[PDB]
Each structure stands twice: as structure tokens, then as C-alpha cells.
Amino acid sequence: IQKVILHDVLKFLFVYILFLLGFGVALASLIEKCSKDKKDCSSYGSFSDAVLELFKLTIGLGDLNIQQNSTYPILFLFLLITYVILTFVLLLNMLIALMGETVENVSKESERIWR
Amino acid sequence: AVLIAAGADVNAHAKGVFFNPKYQHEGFYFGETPLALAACTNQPEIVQLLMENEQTDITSQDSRGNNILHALVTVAEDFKTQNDFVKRMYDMILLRSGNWELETMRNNDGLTPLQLAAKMGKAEILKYILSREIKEKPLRSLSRKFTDWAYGPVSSSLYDLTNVDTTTDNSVLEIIVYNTNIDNRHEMLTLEPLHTLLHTKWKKFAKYMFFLSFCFYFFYNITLTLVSYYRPREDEDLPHPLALTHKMSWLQLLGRMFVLIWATCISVKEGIAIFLLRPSDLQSILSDAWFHFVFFVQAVLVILSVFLYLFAYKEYLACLVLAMALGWANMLYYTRGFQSMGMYSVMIQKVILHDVLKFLFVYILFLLGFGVALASLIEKCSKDKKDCSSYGSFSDAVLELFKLTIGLGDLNIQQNSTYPILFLFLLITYVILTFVLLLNMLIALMGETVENVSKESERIWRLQRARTILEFEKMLPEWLRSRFRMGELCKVADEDFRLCLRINEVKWTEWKTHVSFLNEDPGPIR
Amino acid sequence: AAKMGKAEILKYILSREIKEKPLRSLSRKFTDWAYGPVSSSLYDLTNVDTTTDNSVLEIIVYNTNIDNRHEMLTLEPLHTLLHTKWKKFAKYMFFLSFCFYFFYNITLTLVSYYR
Amino acid sequence: LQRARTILEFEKMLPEWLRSRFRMGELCKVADEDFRLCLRINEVKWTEWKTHVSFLNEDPGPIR
Ligand SMILES: CCCCCCCC/C=C/CCCCCCCC(=O)O[C@@H](COC(=O)CCCCCCCCCCCCCCC)COP(=O)([O-])OCC[N+](C)(C)C
Ligand SMILES: CCCCCCCC/C=C/CCCCCCCC(=O)O[C@@H](COC(=O)CCCCCCCCCCCCCCC)COP(=O)([O-])OCC[N+](C)(C)C
Ligand SMILES: CCCCCCCC/C=C/CCCCCCCC(=O)O[C@@H](COC(=O)CCCCCCCCCCCCCCC)COP(=O)([O-])OCC[N+](C)(C)C
Ligand SMILES: CCCCCCCC/C=C/CCCCCCCC(=O)O[C@@H](COC(=O)CCCCCCCCCCCCCCC)COP(=O)([O-])OCC[N+](C)(C)C
Ligand SMILES: CCCCCCCC/C=C\CCCCCCCC(=O)O[C@@H](COC(=O)CCCCCCCCCCCCCCC)COP(=O)([O-])OCC[N+](C)(C)C
Ligand SMILES: CCCCCCCC/C=C\CCCCCCCC(=O)O[C@@H](COC(=O)CCCCCCCCCCCCCCC)COP(=O)([O-])OCC[N+](C)(C)C
Ligand SMILES: CCCCCCCC/C=C\CCCCCCCC(=O)O[C@@H](COC(=O)CCCCCCCCCCCCCCC)COP(=O)([O-])OCC[N+](C)(C)C
Ligand SMILES: CCCCCCCC/C=C\CCCCCCCC(=O)O[C@@H](COC(=O)CCCCCCCCCCCCCCC)COP(=O)([O-])OCC[N+](C)(C)C
Ligand SMILES: CCCCCCCC/C=C\CCCCCCCC(=O)O[C@@H](COC(=O)CCCCCCCCCCCCCCC)COP(=O)([O-])OCC[N+](C)(C)C
Ligand SMILES: CCCCCCCC/C=C\CCCCCCCC(=O)O[C@@H](COC(=O)CCCCCCCCCCCCCCC)COP(=O)([O-])OCC[N+](C)(C)C
Ligand SMILES: CCCCCCCC/C=C\CCCCCCCC(=O)O[C@@H](COC(=O)CCCCCCCCCCCCCCC)COP(=O)([O-])OCC[N+](C)(C)C
Ligand SMILES: CCCCCCCC/C=C\CCCCCCCC(=O)O[C@@H](COC(=O)CCCCCCCCCCCCCCC)COP(=O)([O-])OCC[N+](C)(C)C
Ligand code: NA
Ligand code: NA
Numbered sequence: 001i002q003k004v005i006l007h008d009v010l011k012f013l014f015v016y017i018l019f020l021l022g023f024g025v026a027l028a029s030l031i032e033k034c035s036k037d038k039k040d041c042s043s044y045g046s047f048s049d050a051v052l053e054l055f056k057l058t059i060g061l062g063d064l065n066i067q068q069n070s071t072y073p074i075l076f077l078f079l080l081i082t083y084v085i086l087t088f089v090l091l092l093n094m095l096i097a098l099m100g101e102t103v104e105n106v107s108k109e110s111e112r113i114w115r
Numbered sequence: 116a117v118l119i120a121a122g123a124d125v126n127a128h129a130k131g132v133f134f135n136p137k138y139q140h141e142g143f144y145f146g147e148t149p150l151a152l153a154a155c156t157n158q159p160e161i162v163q164l165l166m167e168n169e170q171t172d173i174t175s176q177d178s179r180g181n182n183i184l185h186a187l188v189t190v191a192e193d194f195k196t197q198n199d200f201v202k203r204m205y206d207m208i209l210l211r212s213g214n215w216e217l218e219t220m221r222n223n224d225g226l227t228p229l230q231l232a233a234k235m236g237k238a239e240i241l242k243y244i245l246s247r248e249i250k251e252k253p254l255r256s257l258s259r260k261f262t263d264w265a266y267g268p269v270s271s272s273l274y275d276l277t278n279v280d281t282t283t284d285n286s287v288l289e290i291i292v293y294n295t296n297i298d299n300r301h302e303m304l305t306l307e308p309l310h311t312l313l314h315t316k317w318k319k320f321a322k323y324m325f326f327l328s329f330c331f332y333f334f335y336n337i338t339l340t341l342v343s344y345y346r347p348r349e350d351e352d353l354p355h356p357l358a359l360t361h362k363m364s365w366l367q368l369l370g371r372m373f374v375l376i377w378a379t380c381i382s383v384k385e386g387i388a389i390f391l392l393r394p395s396d397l398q399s400i401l402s403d404a405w406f407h408f409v410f411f412v413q414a415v416l417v418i419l420s421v422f423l424y425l426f427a428y429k430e431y432l433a434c435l436v437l438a439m440a441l442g443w444a445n446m447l448y449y450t451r452g453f454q455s456m457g458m459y460s461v462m463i464q465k466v467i468l469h470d471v472l473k474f475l476f477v478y479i480l481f482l483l484g485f486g487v488a489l490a491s492l493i494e495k496c497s498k499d500k501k502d503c504s505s506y507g508s509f510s511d512a513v514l515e516l517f518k519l520t521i522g523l524g525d526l527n528i529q530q531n532s533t534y535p536i537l538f539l540f541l542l543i544t545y546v547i548l549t550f551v552l553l554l555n556m557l558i559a560l561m562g563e564t565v566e567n568v569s570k571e572s573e574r575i576w577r578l579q580r581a582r583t584i585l586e587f588e589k590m591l592p593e594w595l596r597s598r599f600r601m602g603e604l605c606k607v608a609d610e611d612f613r614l615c616l617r618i619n620e621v622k623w624t625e626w627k628t629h630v631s632f633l634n635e636d637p638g639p640i641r
Numbered sequence: 642a643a644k645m646g647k648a649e650i651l652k653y654i655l656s657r658e659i660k661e662k663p664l665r666s667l668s669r670k671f672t673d674w675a676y677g678p679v680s681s682s683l684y685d686l687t688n689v690d691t692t693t694d695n696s697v698l699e700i701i702v703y704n705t706n707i708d709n710r711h712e713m714l715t716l717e718p719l720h721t722l723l724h725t726k727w728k729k730f731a732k733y734m735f736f737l738s739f740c741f742y743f744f745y746n747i748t749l750t751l752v753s754y755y756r
Numbered sequence: 757l758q759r760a761r762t763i764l765e766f767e768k769m770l771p772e773w774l775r776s777r778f779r780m781g782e783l784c785k786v787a788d789e790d791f792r793l794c795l796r797i798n799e800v801k802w803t804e805w806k807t808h809v810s811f812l813n814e815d816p817g818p819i820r
């Protein structure tokens with residue numbers, strides 16, 4: 001647990017927060033003013049709301065709704081599918097492949113480090 | 116020996132089409148002379164027989180401009196195929212000549228034998244030439260490695276930097292880094308006068324220019340984000356906050372000017388670096404100039420978002436938002452200053468090209484295949500008049516199968532389907548093919564890619580940092596390159612100064628008494 | 642030998658080169674020319690090519706019994722002979738087979754979705 | 757092996773006058789009255805050095 005955190009988990013969290021806060025401002029700058037429906041017209045209305053909705057989409061909770069208050073509805077869906085490919089397909093599946101290389105090397109030495 | 120004593124011409128040139136072949140299987144190129152034929156076919160007794168003859172001109176050139184030492188570089192191969200006889204023929208011919216006449220001769224392309232080995236990727240000959248040390252006294256001047264002092268285990272050597280450093284054109288360091296053809300650039304930079312020479316450039320000037328490059332690109336994105344997120348938002352009024360149109364007399368308006376003048380500094384500069392490097396190959400695009408296009412595509416979308424405001428098409432906002440999201444993903448270029456994150460960005464490049472693109476080709480075949488089958492199976496929604504099905508169209512069925520794979524939403528089998536058992540058979544078959552087969556096999560194939568690239572990802576990183584070091588060096592002026600110059604003048608022999616580079620070494624295995632040193636007193640003198 | 646899967650005897654027969662003069666006619670591999678490293682050889686194709694019935698190439702491909710078919714096709718007069726067929730006619734017949742099966746599905750989909 | 761089964765099933769389909777045009781090989785005079793329709797493969801070898809006998813042709817270059 002000590003070797004996996006220092007080698008693998010900290011490099012993952014550095015690249016993930018670059019993509020979380022990067023697509024979070026792009027999607028928040030693309031939503032209109034909510035005066036026409038006066039409440040609950042969008043869940044991406046702020047920077048703090050768009051970062052929360054992209055974090056729920058990675059751990060698997062909630063529900064996906066593309067009927068936002070966006071001016072450009074095709075551009076919103078292009079940036080929201082690109083976020084899924086970079087994190088759900090690339091970064092989370094590569095963390096498992098890099099932990100299997102760390103475990104293979106520390107298994108030779110973990111008994112002498114314990115004593 | 117019968118024919119030479121009978122008067123055979125020892126300077127004939129076999130210049131036919133079979134001896135100057137067009138393709139590699141049609142003929143055999145050896146150097147057109149009978150001295151090169153004996154050397155390229157591993158016949159050392161006939162080489163010694165021909166060099167003793169006084170009529171043998173050892174400095175003759177063929178039609179390509181090559182001489183005897185250019186031709187041995189052309190036919191050289193690895194240790195696996197051609198074990199090592201070419202490296203021993205290069206040494207025997209050079210010592211009998213006794214001059215620098217063959218080493219400093221240029222063929223019709225303008226290359227010496229040292230620059231021809233770096234052009235073709237001959238890493239076993241180039242290891243020999245850069246570290247050539249001759250121990251005998253009258254032939255010591257033909258070396259490129261000199262022992263300055265030695266005392267027991269410790270020694271100190273000097274490596275010649277005549278045509279390997281970037282003080283001239285077509286240097287050895289510039290040919291190895293910028294070579295699109297060969298496929299062992301990252302193994303040729305581990306050689307010893309080249310490995311220390313890039314490490315010296317990174318300490319003196321190159322790490323400080325890589326930090327000013329980071330700071331002014333970070334401030335460029337953080338002032339592009341704030342002016343686009345904090346726009347004046349009205350339905351009746353949409354002022355572009357850039358160029359400072361309203362006379363509000365609000366200072367710190369230079370941040371609005373810093374996006375205009377810095378978008379033109381990038382689009383002009385990255386247009387030149389694409390123009391000077393024509394790859395003519397899609398593999399050379401992805402492997403060397405990926406960050407030249409993607410810094411150029413961003414800086415154009417910032418400029419087009421200002422020309423579309425002057426024409427008022429109201430699609431400028433589509434170009435700013437694409438420039439904001441692309442700009443924060445371009446901060447991953449700057450992870451090559453560090454070894455830990457720089458080797459991690461080499462894994463991301465190899466996993467996308469090998470594993471992720473094959474997954475997306477088979478997944479979209481199954482997504483769009485079951486999407487039309489399930490959409491053609493749902494009735495007309497006039498009986499309930501609204502919300503009777505979520506699979507009513509092709510565009511709705513593709514969306515509901517994408518949500519079912521990433522894990523969101525809710526599964527409902529009470530559709531408006533005519534055949535309710537056939538709908539559930541096609542919806543469970545989609546889960547087995549993607550959730551059980553394709554997503555679990557992507558993890559198993561990434562573990563095979565990671566296992567092979569882990570052997571090579573450090574040498575691939577140092578080739579990516581070496582291209583960053585050299586492009587900083589063509590930028591800074593002539594009077595800065597004299598101050599940050601490597602090496603020191605060393606009196607090698609009588610009237611011979613070569614501007615060498617010093618490397619220290621400790622060795623405990625081969626014990627010997629020391630001769631052929633340049634200096635008797637071992638300690639550092641000043 | 643091709644029927645039973647004897648890959649060590651079949652490697653010997655297909656590349657049999659005899660150097661002596663009166664018994665050179667019993668070869669199946671002849672040196673056309675040579676100059677230094679480069680040479681050029683000739684491989685006999687009497688009963689290994691598909692101009693006759695029960696050829697060696699047809700027995701190795703269509704054999705259900707043996708379990709080393711994919712190792713016996715690496716042998717040398719058989720490896721170049723399949724590469725020559727793919728360049729001359731077989732890659733062009735594999736592309737017309739793709740185009741008329743793609744158009745068959747794309748006209749079956751449109752008439753069933755737009756009923 | 758999966759591509760080789762696709763190549764051969766295309767060859768039984770196309771007619772007899774197409775198989776003469778796409779036929780592999782060339783007639784080679786091996787000995788006195790012996791023609792065998794061989795196939796040519798080139799090779800470069802750097803390890804075993806020897807003098808050359810038992811060749812069919814003295815002049816090494818491609819003749820036409
Ligand atoms: C180097 C090779 C790769 C890169 C190529 C490009 C290089 C540089 C170019 C860069 C951008 C050039 C386009 C800028 C302006 C377009 C924005 C726009 O108007 O919205 C458009 C969306 O169109 C998009 O989504 C564009 C997003 C990028 C697509 C580029 C291909 C990506 C590869 C993935 C390929 C598959 C994905 C295809 C896209 C889905 C549509 O507009 P709207 O939303 O309908 O608004 C209607 C407004 N209304 C409602 C008021 C009536
Ligand atoms: C940070 C998070 C932000 C996240 C935002 C998103 C970003 C996303 C990702 C981002 C990737 C990570 C950030 C990129 C940073 C790279 C910069 C760099 O090159 O660092 C280098 C040092 O840098 C220095 O130069 C030291 C600072 C001294 C002052 C420099 C001012 C120069 C002016 C004064 C000039 C005049 C005076 C000079 C006299 C000659 C580190 O290099 P190194 O390899 O470690 O060095 C070897 C050390 N070793 C031996 C242990 C190996
Ligand atoms: C113009 C297209 C931009 C992307 C568009 C996406 C669709 C186009 C399809 C692109 C096909 C993807 C294949 C990429 C090939 C190599 C990957 C790579 O370089 O890895 C890098 C990681 O960088 C990444 O994260 C790669 C992910 C691509 C998109 C990044 C998010 C941008 C958002 C886009 C939204 C706005 C789109 C607006 C424009 C349409 C690091 O690896 P490297 O070791 O540094 O390798 C470079 C080697 N070199 C340094 C010597 C050169
Ligand atoms: C080679 C060996 C493997 C292949 C074997 C076959 C080879 C070739 C055959 C091909 C298809 C032959 C059947 C065609 C017509 C049947 C369609 C039909 O009427 O719907 C039926 C569903 O039945 C099905 O779901 C059939 C789907 C394929 C099942 C074949 C076994 C798959 C293995 C998986 C094994 C376990 C799964 C079993 C299936 C759940 C029921 O109809 P309904 O929906 O109730 O409609 C009522 C209408 N009403 C409401 C108006 C009153
Ligand atoms: C817990 C979550 C919050 C923690 C954050 C607190 C900051 C302090 C964090 C950690 C404390 C110090 C780091 C580890 C100390 C050295 C040990 C080591 O192996 O380092 C490794 C990892 O080092 C990295 O490169 C991590 C990547 C960037 C770190 C950015 C902060 C953490 C990301 C989360 C937040 C990002 C947002 C903020 C970013 C600006 C170096 O890799 P290596 O290859 O193993 O080198 C060892 C050599 N060896 C293999 C030969 C052995
Ligand atoms: C394990 C983790 C350890 C580390 C912890 C980190 C984990 C979590 C990190 C962060 C979580 C933050 C969530 C929101 C919190 C406060 C909101 C806020 O301040 O935004 C403010 C400014 O926002 C802007 O104006 C735009 C953002 C500017 C920076 C651009 C981000 C790109 C950085 C990418 C690269 C950086 C990273 C590089 C790689 C490291 C505005 O707030 P608001 O929403 O508009 O409020 C409006 C409501 N009101 C009107 C009622 C007043
Ligand atoms: C789990 C594994 C993940 C793998 C992901 C697999 C990938 C693909 C996965 C999923 C793609 C399909 C799912 C959603 C699309 C359809 C949604 C829909 O309802 O239609 C919408 C239309 O929208 C469009 O017409 C544009 C569709 C393309 C969006 C971008 C393509 C991929 C981006 C590439 C990313 C760059 C790559 C860079 C990354 C490195 C809505 O239209 P409508 O409903 O008809 O009604 C509206 C009214 N109207 C008709 C008047 C208009
Ligand atoms: C004049 C005095 C300095 C003050 C103002 C500085 C103004 C400029 C500062 C920073 C520019 C920020 C770069 C971000 C945008 C990239 C595009 C661009 O236009 O930048 C260019 C200029 O970038 C540099 O060359 C940085 C080094 C500073 C050079 C100026 C000092 C010269 C004297 C030396 C003495 C220094 C210290 C010596 C140690 C004692 C290149 O950037 P890049 O990253 O290489 O290109 C992208 C990578 N890519 C090619 C793969 C695509
Ligand atoms: C855990 C207890 C609680 C947290 C502690 C309290 C906070 C701790 C604060 C600071 C510690 C943060 C980590 C720095 C040291 C990591 C060690 C390392 O190897 O780094 C390497 C790269 O790692 C990087 O530096 C990547 C750049 C990411 C941004 C971090 C910049 C650090 C400046 C600090 C600013 C703060 C940013 C973060 C603060 C939010 C160094 O590069 P390298 O030497 O060339 O490669 C090493 C490989 N080798 C070992 C084989 C040679
Ligand atoms: C980002 C998402 C959108 C991108 C799409 C843009 C198109 C351009 C895409 C990528 C640019 C060019 C491809 C890579 C260039 C060569 C590098 C390479 O290694 O190729 C590899 C992958 O090549 C494939 O075979 C991919 C599978 C089919 C690709 C279909 C488009 C992408 C699927 C998504 C969209 C599908 C929908 C459209 C399809 C009609 C070949 O495999 P290899 O075994 O590694 O060979 C290397 C040899 N080696 C191992 C000895 C080293
Ligand atoms: C990383 C990814 C990069 C690449 C991007 C791709 C990712 C995303 C790709 C695609 C997402 C597209 C989502 C829908 C968007 C437009 C809708 C549309 O045009 O359908 C139209 C035609 O539709 C038909 O008539 C049936 C389909 C014909 C083709 C058959 C599909 C099988 C292809 C399988 C093999 C192909 C792949 C092979 C392997 C590659 C009808 O539209 P509608 O729904 O009926 O509207 C009705 C509403 N209205 C009545 C109000 C008007
Ligand atoms: C007559 C002139 C041509 C114009 C009309 C063409 C009409 C037909 C074109 C394409 C048919 C499309 C196939 C899809 C459906 C498969 C079933 C089927 O019936 O197809 C069959 C015919 O398929 C072929 O043989 C393709 C090659 C064309 C043969 C006709 C030219 C003969 C002359 C040669 C000169 C060519 C050029 C030489 C270069 C100079 C076989 O298809 P399959 O894929 O092998 O079978 C499935 C695989 N499986 C066996 C494992 C199951
Ligand atoms: Na879930
Ligand atoms: Na859920």
C-alpha cells in the first residue's frame with residue numbers, strides 16, 4: 001500500500017485534475033442565463049457545478065442529461081464524450097496496468113522491508 | 116600475387132550498373148576499387164598485399180565521391196549478422212595511412228566518414244570513432260580520446276569535440292537528433308561524448324529557458340480563461356471583452372492585450388517550424404511534430420474568435436471554448452522537464468496508438484449495429500402520446516446503449532416493443548459483448564503494452580528532451596553562445612589544439628602501469 | 642509428409658541442394674548466381690503449387706487432423722508463394738468482396754428502418 | 757493461416773484462362789533437357805565465406 005501510493009496513485013491524480021478542471025471551465029462557459037425557466041434549467045451553470053457533475057460521471061453515480069441550456073448542443077456533446085474517452089477508457093484502465101508492474105517488483109523485496 | 120607481379124592495374128574502377136545498384140537485391144556495392152573489394156569481403160591478407168604496392172592510390176574516390184573509409188561505413192551491419200570484421204578493417208587501413216586525409220574528405224553529398232555513420236544509423240562504427248584511443252607514440256595524434264592523468268584506479272580522459280558539437284553545420288549531434296529515417300536514435304544518444312554534452316547544456320542555460328517557457332504559457336491560459344468565463348452576459352448585448360472596446364477607464368487592461376499579441380507570436384513561429392520540417396509521412400507526424408500542430412491550432416482559433424466578432428456571426432463563442440479546452444490539455448507538453456512525469460507521458464502515447472484505437476473501432480461497430488436493430492423494433496407512440504419508449508429513434512437508442520456501458524441511468528425493459536422477449540435477448544447480448552468481453556480485454560492488453568515499453572521509456576524520454584535543448588540553442592544570439600560554450604583548449608601534441616571535454620572514471624578490474632598520459636602531476640591544476 | 646504433419650522431413654525435401662556434379666540433378670534448390678555476399682536461388686515448384694491436384698500447398702492448408710499447420714506455412718517456397726498470390730489478384734478480390742457486402746447491409750438496414 | 761485459406765478459395769473460383777495469366781514462376785534450364793518452372797528468392801549472407809562453384813550462370817546481373 002505504501003509503494004503503490006507513492007509510485008502510481010500520485011501520478012494519476014496529477015493528470016486527472018488537469019483534465020477535470022480543464023473541461024470544467026469549457027462546459028461552464030457554454031451555458032446560457034437561466035432566467036427563462038427561472039430554476040433548474042441546467043446542472044452545468046457554474047464552474048463549481050460543472051466540476052461536480054464530471055466527478056459523479058467518473059465514479060458512476062447519477063444520471064446523464066444532455067438537454068442543457070447550451071447554445072451549441074453538438075459542441076457540448078463533443079466535449080462530454082471526449083472527457084469519457086480520456087478518463088474512463090484511458091486513465092482508469094492504465095492505472096491497473098501500471099500497478100501490475102509495481103506489484104511484480106516489490107513482491108521480491110516486501111518481506112525484507114517488513115522485517 | 117601472380118597477376119600483380121605480371122602488371123595488373125591496381126586502380127581499376129568497376130562502374131557498371133551491377134556494381135552501382137538501384138535496389139538492394141539487384142547488385143553489390145563495395146566501393147568500385149579492388150582495395151575496397153578485398154576489405155568488404157573479409158580478406159585481410161590481400162589488403163596487406165595491396166597496401167604494400169606503391170601504385171596503390173589509397174585516397175582515390177569513386178563516382179559517388181566515396182573513398183575507402185566511406186565504403187566501409189556503407190556496408191556495415193550489426194554484430195548479429197556481420198559479427199565485427201568491418202570495425203577491424205577500419206582500424207588497419209587508417210593506421211597505415213598515418214594522416215587525417217581520409218577522415219577529413221567530403222563526398223558528393225558533403226559528408227565525412229564521421230557524418231555518414233550518423234546519417235545512416237551505424238551505431239557500432241560510431242562508437243569506435245568517437246572513443247578512438249591509440250597507445251603507441253608516433254601514431255597517438257590520430258586519436259579522439261586522450262588520458263590526461265591517472266593514479267591507481269582514478270583516471271581523467273579528454274574527448275575531442277571537433278565536428279560533434281553544434282559550433283558548425285551538419286554536426287554529429289544535430290544529425291542524430293533530427294533524423295527521421297533511422298529507428299535507433301535513442302540508442303545512439305547513450306554514447307559517451309554525446310551523453311555528457313547534452314547534460315552540460317541542460318544545467319547551463321536550457322533548464323532556465325524551459326521554466327520561462329512554462330510561466331508565460333501558464334499566464335496566457337489563465338488570462339484567456341478569466342476573460343471568457345467572466346464575460347458580460349446579456350441577451351441583448353454581447354461585448355467581446357478582448358481589445359478593450361468600452362471606455363471604462365479600467366486598468367489592468369493589458370491582460371486583454373496579452374491574448375492578442377501572444378496569439379500572433381505562436382501562430383507565426385509554429386507555422387515556420389511546420390514549414391521547415393516536411394515529414395511526408397503520417398508516422399513522422401505523430402512521433403515528432405504533434406505539439407507543433409496543436410500549439411498552432413489553438414493560436415488560430417483565438418485569432419478567428421476576434422475576426423468573427425468584427426463580422427458578428429455569433430459563432431465566435433464556439434471558437435473560444437474550443438481554444439480553452441485545448442489549451443489546458445497542452446500543458447502536458449511541459450512534463451518532459453522531469454524524469455518521473457516525462458516517462459509517464461511516453462506510456463500515454465504508446466497506449467493510445469496501440470490499444471485504445473483498436474478498441475474504439477470494434478465498439479462503434481457493435482454500438483451502431485444493435486442501435487438500429489432495437490430502434491426498428493419499437494411501435495408508434497400515439498397510444499400514450501408521450502414518453503412511451505426511450506428507444507423510439509436511432510439517435511435515442513444509441514444514447515441509451517452508451518449510458519448503459521458507462522454505468523449511468525436506469526434499465527427499463529417495459530418499452531413499446533411488439534416482441535418483448537426478442538428485445539431482451541438483444542439487450543443482454545450487448546452487455547456480454549461489451550461489459551464482459553471488450554472492456555475487460557482492454558485491461559489485459561494494456562498490461563502487455565506497459566511491460567514492453569517499460570524497458571525503453573527512459574531512452575525515448577531523453578530523445579524528447581534533447582530536441583527541446585537544441586531548439587533553444589538556435590534561438591539565442593551569437594554573443595550568448597560564446598559564453599555558454601562547452602570545452603577547453605588542450606595542447607595535445609606539437610601545434611595541436613582540439614577543444615576537448617573532460618570525463619572522470621574509476622576502474623578496479625584491469626590493473627596496469629600507466630604510460631601515454633598527457634600530464635605527470637595528477638591533481639587538478641586551477 | 643504434408644498429410645501427416647512431418648515438418649522436419651518436409652523442410653529437408655523442399656530445400657534439397659546437392660553440390661556434387663553427377664548428382665546435382667536430384668536437387669530442388671539451385672544457385673542461379675552469386676557474388677560475394679549476395680546470391681540468388683531457385684526453388685522447384687513441381688508438386689507444391691496448385692497447378693495439379695493434391696498439391697503440397699493444398700494439403701497443408703485444408704488439413705483438419707494435424708495441429709501444426711501454422712508452423713508448416715513458414716517454410717520457404719510456401720511462404721513466398723502465398724505472398725505472390727496476395728499481390729497479384731487476391732487483395733483485389735478481397736476488396737470487391739467487402740464492397741458488395743457493405744452495400745448489401747446498408748440497403749437492408751434502410752428499407753427495414755424506413756418502413 | 758486464416759488469410760491463406762481465403763487466398764486459395766478465391767483461386768478455385770476464377771476461370772481457367774485467368775489462372776494462366778496470374779501464374780507464378782519461370783522456366784529454367786537446369787540441366788540437359790530438364791525444365792522445372794522454379795521460383796526465385798534473393799539472399800544476403802555475411803558469415804560463411806567460401807569460393808563459389810555449382811552455379812547455373814556465370815554472369816551475376818539480372819538478364820532482362
Ligand atoms: C487534425 C485532424 C483532427 C482535427 C480536425 C479539425 C482541426 C482543427 C479544427 C478545430 C475546430 C474547427 C471547428 C470550429 C467551429 C465548430 C463549432 C460549431 O459551430 O459547432 C458545430 C459542432 O462541431 C464540432 O463539434 C467541432 C468540434 C471539433 C471537431 C473537429 C474534428 C474532431 C475529430 C472527431 C471526429 C468526429 C466528431 C465530429 C464533431 C462532432 C455544430 O454547431 P451546433 O452545435 O449545431 O450549433 C448550432 C447553433 N444553433 C443551435 C443556434 C442553431
Ligand atoms: C507546478 C505545477 C503547475 C500545474 C499547472 C499545470 C501544469 C501541468 C504539468 C506541468 C509540468 C510540471 C511543471 C513544469 C516546470 C518545468 C520547469 C523546469 O525546467 O524545472 C526544472 C528546474 O527549474 C528551474 O529552473 C529551477 C528554478 C530556478 C529559478 C528559475 C527562473 C529563471 C530565471 C533566472 C535565470 C538567470 C540566473 C541563472 C544562472 C545560470 C527541473 O529540472 P530537473 O530535471 O529537476 O533538474 C535536475 C535536478 N535533478 C538532478 C534532481 C534531476
Ligand atoms: C488538433 C487535434 C487536437 C486533439 C483533438 C481531439 C480529436 C483528434 C484526434 C486525435 C487522436 C489522438 C492520438 C494522439 C497521438 C499521440 C498522443 C500524445 O501525443 O500523447 C501526449 C498526451 O496528449 C494527450 O492527452 C492525447 C489526447 C488527445 C487529445 C487531448 C485533449 C484535447 C481536447 C480536444 C478538444 C478540442 C479539439 C479542438 C481541435 C479539433 C503525450 O505523449 P508524447 O510523448 O508527448 O507524444 C508526442 C511526441 N512528441 C512530443 C515528440 C511529438
Ligand atoms: C447454432 C446454435 C446457436 C443458434 C441457434 C439458432 C440458429 C438459427 C436461428 C436463428 C433465429 C431463429 C428464431 C427466429 C424467430 C424467433 C423470434 C420470436 O418470435 O421471438 C421469440 C423470442 O425468441 C428469440 O429470442 C430468438 C432469438 C435467437 C435465439 C436462438 C438461440 C440463441 C442462443 C441463446 C440461448 C438462450 C436464449 C434463448 C432465446 C431467449 C418469442 O417471441 P415473443 O417476443 O414472445 O413475441 C410474442 C408476440 N406477442 C407479444 C404479440 C404475443
Ligand atoms: C494524497 C493526495 C494529495 C497529495 C498532494 C500533496 C503534494 C505532495 C505529494 C506527494 C509528496 C512528495 C511526492 C513523493 C516523494 C518522493 C517519492 C516518489 O517516489 O515520488 C514519485 C511520485 O512523485 C511525483 O512525481 C508525483 C506527481 C506530481 C505530484 C503533484 C502532487 C500530487 C498530486 C495530487 C494533487 C495534485 C494537485 C496539486 C499539484 C500542484 C516519483 O516517481 P518515481 O518514478 O517513483 O521516482 C522514484 C524513483 N524510483 C522509481 C527509482 C524509486
Ligand atoms: C486529491 C486532491 C488534492 C488537491 C486538491 C484539489 C482537488 C479539487 C480542486 C479544485 C476543486 C474546486 C471546486 C470549486 C471550488 C471554488 C470555486 C472557485 O473558486 O471558482 C471561482 C473562480 O473560478 C473561475 O473563475 C474559473 C477557474 C479559474 C482557473 C481555471 C481552472 C483550470 C486549472 C487546470 C490546471 C490546474 C491543476 C493542474 C494539475 C494539478 C468562481 O466560483 P463560482 O463557481 O463561479 O461561484 C459562483 C457562485 N456565486 C455567484 C454565488 C458567487
Ligand atoms: C464506454 C466506452 C466509451 C467509448 C466512447 C465511444 C465513442 C462514441 C460513443 C458514443 C457516441 C454516440 C452517443 C451520443 C450521440 C447521439 C446522442 C443523440 O441523442 O443525438 C443527438 C445528436 O447529436 C449528434 O448528431 C452528434 C453525435 C456525435 C457526437 C460526437 C461524436 C464522438 C466524439 C469523438 C471524440 C474525439 C476523440 C478524442 C479522444 C482522445 C441529439 O439529436 P436528437 O436526439 O436526434 O434530437 C435533437 C433535435 N434535432 C434532431 C433537431 C437535432
Ligand atoms: C529577452 C529576455 C527574456 C525576457 C522575455 C522572454 C520572452 C519569451 C519567454 C517565454 C515564452 C513562453 C513560451 C510559451 C509559448 C510557446 C510559443 C512561443 O512563442 O515561445 C517561444 C519562446 O519561448 C522561449 O524561448 C522561452 C525561453 C526564453 C527566451 C528569451 C531569452 C533569450 C536569452 C537566453 C537567456 C535565458 C537565461 C540564460 C541562463 C542565465 C518558444 O517556446 P517553446 O516552448 O520552445 O515552443 C513550443 C514547443 N514546440 C516547439 C514543440 C511546439
Ligand atoms: C505526503 C505528505 C503530505 C504532503 C506534503 C506537503 C506538500 C509537499 C510540497 C511539495 C512536494 C510535491 C512533490 C515534489 C517532489 C516529488 C519527488 C520527485 O521525484 O519529483 C520529481 C518530479 O516530480 C515533479 O516535480 C512533477 C511536477 C508536478 C508539480 C510539483 C512541483 C514541485 C514544486 C513544489 C510546489 C508544491 C506542489 C505540490 C503541493 C500541492 C523530481 O524530478 P526528477 O528529479 O527529475 O525525477 C525524479 C526521478 N528520479 C528520482 C529517479 C531521479
Ligand atoms: C481518437 C478517436 C478518433 C480518431 C479517429 C481518426 C482516424 C485516424 C486514427 C488514427 C491515426 C492513424 C492510426 C495510427 C498510425 C500508426 C501507428 C499505429 O501503431 O497504428 C496501430 C493502430 O492502427 C489501427 O489499426 C487502428 C484501428 C482502426 C483505426 C480506425 C480509426 C480509429 C478508430 C476510432 C474511430 C472509428 C470510427 C471511424 C473509422 C472509419 C496499428 O497497430 P500496431 O500493431 O501497433 O502496428 C504498429 C506496428 N508495431 C506494433 C510493430 C509498432
Ligand atoms: C471516438 C469516436 C470518433 C468517430 C466518431 C463516431 C462516434 C459516434 C458515431 C455515430 C453517432 C451518431 C448518432 C446519431 C446522429 C445523427 C442521426 C442520423 O443521422 O441517423 C439518421 C439515419 O439513420 C438511419 O437511417 C439508420 C442508420 C444507417 C446506418 C446504419 C448504422 C450501422 C453502421 C455500423 C458500422 C459503422 C462503423 C464501423 C466501424 C467504425 C436518422 O436520424 P433519426 O434518428 O431517425 O432522426 C429522427 C428525428 N426526426 C424525425 C425529428 C427527424
Ligand atoms: C465478374 C467481374 C466482377 C464484377 C462483379 C463481381 C461480383 C461478385 C463480387 C463481390 C461479391 C461480394 C461478396 C459478399 C458476399 C459473400 C458471398 C458471395 O456470394 O460472394 C462470393 C463472391 O465474392 C468474390 O469472389 C469477390 C471477388 C470478385 C469475383 C468476381 C471476379 C472474378 C474475376 C477475377 C479478377 C478480379 C480482379 C483481378 C485483378 C486484376 C464469395 O465471397 P466470400 O467473401 O469469399 O465468401 C464469404 C467468406 N466465407 C467463405 C468464409 C464464408
Ligand atoms: Na455504476
Ligand atoms: Na446509477
Ligand code: NA
Pocket residue numbers: 096097100558559562
Ligand atoms: Na491486470
